[model samples]
Target: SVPSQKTYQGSYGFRLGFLVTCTYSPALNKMFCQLAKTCPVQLWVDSTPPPGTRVRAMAIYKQSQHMTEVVRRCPHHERSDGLAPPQHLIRVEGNLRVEYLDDRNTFRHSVVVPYEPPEVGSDCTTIHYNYMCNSSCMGGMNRSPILTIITLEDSSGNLLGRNSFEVRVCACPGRDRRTEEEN
Candidate 1:
């Protein structure tokens, strides 16, 4: 049986929010964030069993070059309210929109990056998105987190791994200027 609570020293953002059960040290506080299919799973942090921060983890394939990996060209925000057009996008092939209760227990905008095909050996992909500010003209910043569910599958159609993570766009360049023109 799993313990109701755990102890943790730190957390990292790897594999989004999914975690795989494996042998790990209480001090390391690290684990695989993949399951059967590509999806995001939420876990609570506490100080009994082992509370730890989520770390970033990358996908790997053994004896195969036909694998996929996700990459971002821009820096992702950990916390922000508004976003500008031409915002940084995650290089993914597919995505899913999910609604969940937020820290205030309110339903918010969330997305899932489901499993997709990767480039052969060294192929790459690019994508984009638009983030809405608190108000179109008013331009107030609100805390909106983009939750993503990522999956990995080989060319053979076998599940390789899965991941879930959150990123914010925040205010980008020329964002404030656009709001000023309306007034």
Candidate 2:
């Protein structure tokens, strides 16, 4: 689940697969387009649940590094028609602003720095869509989000901690979500 109006066209549904990459800029959104570039194994978003829709819960894969399970209501549009499609992410809100609670119930908040890839190889001949390039070219502008709290246990189920970040929407790439070994 990406931003509303955005779509997650990963090769696999919830489980991990190819294109283990992410985006958080505006430049790459045009040339690279969609999660197809890095084979985003897991892409989720938080959206407002539409009425009359069923709240679907998906168990995050055992290998997932983020939250445990994703709780969200079904999309408003039909899959065939293409409205708000479903995925393995919690549809809470875009650019989540969450409070901080450490392992001891202590409260603290600070901006998290995201992981950013290196710049393009100036002497390179071709943009081969390699993992490095794909990862580097993510969103074109790299404001890498910090993994403030990728994982946390919720005893009260009332949220022991909350983290937030921003993600701009992009179109699904026309190419397949797979990378080929260099020839």
**Candidate with maximal lDDT:** 1
What is the per-residue lDDT of model 1 for residues 37-106, given as tens digits with 9 covering 90 to 100?
1222333222211122111122221112211222222233322212211222322112342211112332
Off by over 4 Å in 1: 1-105, 121-127, 134-183
Give the alpha-carbon lDDT of every model. 0.25, 0.22
Q: After superposition, how far is residue 7 of candidate 1 from its true place, in Å?
A: 15
After the best TM-score superposition of candidate 1, give how far the Cα of residue 183 lies from its true spot, in angstroms.
29
Q: TM-score of predicted model 1?
A: 0.22
Over 19-82, each residue of candidate 2 has an lDDT whose tens digit, in order, gives 2133332222222233223322222223211222211111221223323322222243112112
lDDT of 1: 0.25
Off by over 4 Å in 2: 1-21, 25-153, 172-183
